[PDB]
């Protein structure tokens, strides 16, 4: 009976592959061949946010595009003011091994997590003028890689236990557990409508999920190694993935297959962070070789290099209005480029 | 813009608190990664003091923080990249169990050659030396079964055996160390070094050994920094 199930899985995969090939009437590379190249784009460090005393492992931009939160291994969660380099808050973390952080769309909440298996929600808009742990979300059996806020009530997180969970902050319990990944889930990305989200894991596969029902809808493959980063295309019907094979892959939810390949023979180190800018024409990817190249998503080629970091570019996020992009790294500095 | 001056003053006081925390933290306080297997007595290393542990102890008024990550899965390649700024990796090895000693060697090799842990000097702790001695003295299990090179092995001339130690016990323990040192010196370069120590579940000198190797590690780092090494 197990052999029958394996045969059914194999024939389902073959049918999916055949459908993908049939839908592959043309190639996106040749379809975009008519697009004129933008040319070499130059982006310079506008702000350098110093004050962290250890590696910066994650950051998240605010919806206001003014305040950004950064997490560092020293045990601080600084809410900077990118415009004026002012540290609005500096939250002391109970566990210094923070691997992720999110800034709520409302702006009244910030989450963080890491090797403590706990997503700690912090209130930045308390009436007493301080920062306190709003809620200690517990229930994951692995390190938190990425957590994102749907709203001030719901937060979806990704763990190292191959599962993602949707939480209710007031309730403090897992509304829905997203099971199906085989390796550690390393990144999260929410669609602009917040009804679907993808999560690349350490199995060379990215899975598309539904937040409401709570089951995997589309499993994407095509990577050669552990996927470390993932983000949705601004249209919301596509996403990009960065992995250890020094290659970025763009997928389509509708087509359900790989579209393009963002790799070069000169880049050997893997990717740690991927983020579209505002229109899905620029794909900024952070590599371990201390700089984060800028790739033209449409032209599927490299059209810029963002050098200036003295260590691995762990985190890379773009403003929600497209006016800037911040690149935190292990050198204890966030550089905002424009 | 009075709000701007207020925000700037708050940023200045915040930065002052950050700097004060940095001094009080990175001064006579060192971070260590306590790593090992379930069988290895990693927990019972230093007798004198839900996702990650933290053991704090002092020797010469210098603080040490051991981080025992004991809640993640068995896939170690991603959460271990966080510990690339620690002073040392406290690798604990169970010398008695030769069956899992090969995978302990493989873990040591992966840590040594890891692209991020390639600058961290491992403080190797060959634990359960009493059990290893009892096993080799009984002779029910033979090391040359799990390693067909122990037969063509002799104890090093620089060995310092215990006075009440059997030559076979000394040969066995020094063979295991040299097996670890082989991986260490194959690709050790000059930025990180392995410090092996034969320790038991009763010896209370693990803290002093960690203190001395951390001193040696930091001294060699400083000598390299000032181009004296």
């Amino acid at each position, epitope marked *: 009976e197990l052999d029958q199930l394996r045969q059914e899985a194999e024939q389902l*995969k073959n049918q999916i592959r055949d459908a993908r090939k049939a839908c592959a009437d043309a190639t996106l590379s040749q379809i975009t061949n008519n697009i004129d190249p933008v040319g070499r784009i130059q982006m310079r460090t506008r702000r350098t946010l110093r004050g962290h005393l250890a590696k910066i492992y994650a950051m998240h931009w605010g919806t206001d595009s003014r305040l950004l939160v950064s997490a560092s291994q020293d045990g601080k969660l600084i809410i900077w003011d990118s415009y004026t380099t002012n540290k609005v808050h500096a939250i002391p973390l109970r566990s210094s091994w923070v691997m992720t952080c999110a800034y709520a769309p409302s702006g009244n909440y910030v989450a963080c997590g890491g090797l403590d298996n706990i997503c700690s929600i912090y209130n930045l808009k308390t009436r007493e003028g301080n920062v306190r742990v709003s809620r200690e979300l517990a229930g994951h059996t692995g390190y938190l890689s990425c957590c994102r806020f749907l709203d001030d009530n719901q937060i979806v997180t990704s763990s190292g236990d*191959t599962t993602c969970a949707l939480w209710d902050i007031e309730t403090g319990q897992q509304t829905t557990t997203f099971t199906g990944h*085989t*390796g550690d889930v390393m990144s999260l990305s929410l669609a602009p409508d917040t009804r679907l989200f993808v999560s690349g894991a*350490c*199995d*060379a*596969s990215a899975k598309l999920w539904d937040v409401r029902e709570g089951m995997c809808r589309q499993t994407f*493959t*095509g*990577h*050669e*190694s*552990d996927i470390n980063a993932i983000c949705f295309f601004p249209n919301g019907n596509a996403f990009a993935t960065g992995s*250890d*094979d*020094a290659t970025c892959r763009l997928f389509d939810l509708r087509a359900d297959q790989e579209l393009m390949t963002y790799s070069h023979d000169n880049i*050997i*180190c*893997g990717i740690t962070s991927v983020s579209f800018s505002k229109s899905g024409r620029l794909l900024l990817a952070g590599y371990d070789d201390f700089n984060c190249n800028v790739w033209d998503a449409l032209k599927a080629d490299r059209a810029g290099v963002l050098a200036g970091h003295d260590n691995r570019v762990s985190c890379l996020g773009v403003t929600d209005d497209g006016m800037a992009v911040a690149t935190g790294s292990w050198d204890s500095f966030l550089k905002i480029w424009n | 813009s009075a709000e701007d001056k207020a925000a700037a003053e708050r940023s200045k006081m915040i930065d002052k608190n950050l700097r004060e925390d940095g001094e009080k933290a990175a001064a006579a306080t060192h971070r260590l990664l306590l790593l090992g297997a379930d069988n290895s007595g990693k927990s019972t290393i230093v007798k004198q003091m839900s996702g990650i542990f933290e053991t704090k102890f002092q020797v010469d008024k210098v603080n040490f923080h051991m981080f025992d990550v004991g809640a993640q*899965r*068995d*896939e*170690r*390649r991603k959460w*271990i990249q966080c510990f690339n700024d620690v002073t040392a990796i406290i690798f604990v090895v169970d010398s008695s169990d030769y*069956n899992r000693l*090969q*995978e302990a060697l*493989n873990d040591f*090799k*992966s*840590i*040594w*050659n*890891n*692209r991020w842990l390639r600058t961290i000097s491992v403080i190797l702790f060959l634990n359960k030396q009493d059990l290893l001695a009892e096993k080799v003295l009984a002779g029910k299990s033979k090391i040359e*079964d*799990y*390693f*067909p*090179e122990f037969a063509r092995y002799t104890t090093p001339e620089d060995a310092t055996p215990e006075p009440g130690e059997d030559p076979r016990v000394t040969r066995a323990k020094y063979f295991i160390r040299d097996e670890f040192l082989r991986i260490s010196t194959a*690709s050790g370069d000059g930025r990180h070094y392995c410090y092996p120590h034969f320790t038991c579940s009763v010896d209370t000198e693990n803290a002093r050994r960690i203190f001395n190797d951390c001193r040696d590690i930091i001294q060699r780092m400083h000598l390299r920094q000032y181009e004296l090494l």
Partner: nanobody
Amino acid sequence: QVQLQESGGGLVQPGGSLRLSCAASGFTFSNYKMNWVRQAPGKGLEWVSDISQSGASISYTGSVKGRFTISRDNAKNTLYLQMNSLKPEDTAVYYCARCPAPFTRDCFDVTSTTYAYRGQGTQVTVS
């Protein structure tokens, strides 16, 4: 999709030989360190052999040195393990798990319980 399918194995008397064959498609086989992982029935997975990207850093576990030999064909994207002179202790399921990342000399996680890049495996029985 990364795929690792093994062909070989079966029932052989002690002292016999078996050339296991793992076909690895989907990824650049010439760019990854490749391992052989075996799980004895009732025991955890044990790393049993290893090769390099080219095939010059070959290393073996102690229990099989002088008995097993590993070889990689870059063009054929296939790797083998000639398990000659097999002993009754060699009864296990053999996996051809590759390494998590290319260009690296460390294979940090290949004997884990739920490693992503293992093959299905071939049960090798010796009696």
